[PDB]
Amino acid sequence: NYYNLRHPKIEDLRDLIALETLCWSENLQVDNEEIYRRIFKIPQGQFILELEDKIVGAIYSQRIDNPQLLDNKTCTQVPLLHTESGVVVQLLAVNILPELQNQGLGDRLLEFMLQYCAQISGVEKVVAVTLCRNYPDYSPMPMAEYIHQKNESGLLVDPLLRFHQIHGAKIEKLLPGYRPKDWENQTCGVLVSYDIQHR
Ligand SMILES: [Cl-]
């Protein structure tokens, strides 16, 4: 329960690759080179969660000029969009070791990140391209309808979209072809946005 939150160092590389493998299927993982880019080129944009000298989580980001740039892109191209002075922070992933999920860690990490981005000079907006977890249970309902499907009390039915919703995200739109290998979601990412102006 003794947690530390810090920016990554190069030495974290192998543990963060290990975290990537544990958190995502092979088709959904980013490659080792991208983990290295984040920690070498943009350490101020990433946060690592430690539990007694062991990494158990990470939240990642980069800065881009505007969300429209994400249209018609794949996840492997989006690193090329990074700009040092971009007014939009793009959250790239929230990773929590599966054995430690549903303990509020993701919640705390996202909140911290959101607060942190709100005080970065020049940053106007935060967005993320996330994805559904349970679309195969609802197929063939169109994904464009599914991503807004709320139960009777109003939380989104999809647990990954709900996570963003409960932290103040607005579901913007589908991004077809964002993840060519994500066949359960028919390649589609989901763009969400955070209004950070109150922060
Ligand atoms: Cl640059």
Q: What is the CATH number of the domain that holds 42?
A: 3.40.630.30
What is the distance in A from the centroid of ligand 1 to the CA of 46?
17
Enumerate helices (H) and strands (E) in the chain, giving the number of each: 5, 7
* Residue 99 tokens, joined: 């054995």
Q: Which domain holds residue 18?
A: 1-199
64 C-alpha to ligand 1 centroid (Å): 9
Contacts (Cβ under 8 Å, ≥6 apart) of 67: 88, 90, 125, 127, 172, 191, 193
CB of 85 closer than 8 Å to CB of 122: yes
Q: Give the chain's domain count.
A: 1
User: Rounded to whole angstroms, how far apart are CA atoms 158 and 155?
Assistant: 9
φ/ψ (deg, to 5) at 137: -75, -20
E strands, 73-167, are 88-96, 125-130
Ligand 1 centroid – CA 86 distance (Å): 9
Strand spans (E) along 86-157: 88-96, 125-130
Resolution in A: 2.0
Distance 35 CA to ligand 1 centre (A): 18
Q: For 55-77, give one letter per residue: b (16+ CB within 10 A) or e.
A: bbbbbbbbbbeebebbeebebee
Q: How was this structure determined?
A: X-ray
Ligand 1 mean position to 82 CA, how many Å?
7
**What is the residue type of 127?**
V
Q: Is 106 annotated as a binding residue?
A: yes
Residues 6+ apart with CB under 8 A from 10: 39, 40
Q: Output the CA 14–ligand 1 centroid distance in Å.
A: 26
The two structure tokens encoding residue 40: 């070498």
138 CA to centre of ligand 1 in angstroms: 41
168 marked as part of a ligand binding site: no
